[PDB]
Amino acid sequence: MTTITGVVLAGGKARRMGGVDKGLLELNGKPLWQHVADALMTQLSHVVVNANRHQEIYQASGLKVIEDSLADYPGPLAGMLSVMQQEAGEWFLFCPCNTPYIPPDLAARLNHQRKDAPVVWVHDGERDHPTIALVNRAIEPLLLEYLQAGERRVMVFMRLAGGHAVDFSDHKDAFVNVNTPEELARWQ
Ligand SMILES: [Li+]
């Protein structure tokens, strides 16, 4: 009953009892994933999080936590598919839990620039961010087929699905990633 569901992708796996839980690192007191969820809630009424470790902690801010299917598909596409299989509604705006500075016109600009494509993603002027992506329902069967086929490559999938990049080069450092504790330390 809203047009796009926002989704924070907080990672899959724990293919060696985790390591650092990136989404739970705190940037100025607030977990990175909650920075992203808050930014998505500025622009979208319905936001959920895909998390596969420390689920009770993710649950504490009162959003729906969605875990990956038993299929244990690889890579960020596995989380995308698991969320489309467990949420209704025609459009999803995915964003990793690592990009706390995403802007309040993310959804609006991706939608304005979608131009009939079933998926679009952010390009920051330097690189693609294919997991910051507005994705239509129609992608779900294609994603299932790709991951059942043993594939993992994100950009290859986005190309196969007929997507395109949307230029956010004018949004300075809104798309920076905080992948390690060492980077985070800098941004405080
Ligand atoms: Li642990």
Structural domain including 29 reads 1-188
Helix 76-86 vs helix 139-148: crossing angle, to nearest 10 = 130
How many angstroms separate the alpha carbon of residue 115 from the centre of ligand 1? 44
Q: Is 145 helix (H, G, I), strand (E, B) or coil?
A: helix
How many angstroms separate the alpha carbon of residue 157 from the centre of ligand 1? 32
Q: For tokens 């500075």, name the residue.
A: 101
How many angstroms separate the alpha carbon of residue 97 from the centre of ligand 1? 18
How many angstroms separate the alpha carbon of residue 1 from the centre of ligand 1? 37
How distant, in Å, are the alpha carbons of 30, 36, 39, 87 from that of 61?
11, 13, 14, 19
How many angstroms separate the alpha carbon of residue 64 from the centre of ligand 1? 21
Q: Is-contact 135 119, C-beta < 8 A?
A: yes
Report how far residue 106's alpha carbon sits from residue 126's, in angstroms, rounded to the nearest whole number.
Answer: 17
Report how far residue 141's alpha carbon sits from residue 63's, in angstroms, rounded to the nearest whole number.
Answer: 26
Q: CB 48: neighbour CB atoms within 10 A?
A: 19
Tokens linked to 64: 């729906």
Domain CATH number, residue 153: 3.90.550.10
Q: For tokens 């405080």, name the residue.
A: 188
Number of domains in the chain: 1
Q: Is-contact 178 32, C-beta < 8 A?
A: yes
How many angstroms separate the alpha carbon of residue 158 from the centre of ligand 1? 33
How many angstroms separate the alpha carbon of residue 70 from the centre of ligand 1? 21
How were these coordinates obtained? X-ray
How many angstroms separate the alpha carbon of residue 18 from the centre of ligand 1? 7
How many angstroms separate the alpha carbon of residue 81 from the centre of ligand 1? 25
**Strand ranges inside the chain, DSSP E:** 4-9, 26-27, 30-31, 47-50, 65-66, 91-96, 119-123, 128-136, 164-167
Resolution at which this structure was determined, Å: 1.6
Tokens linked to 149: 């086929």
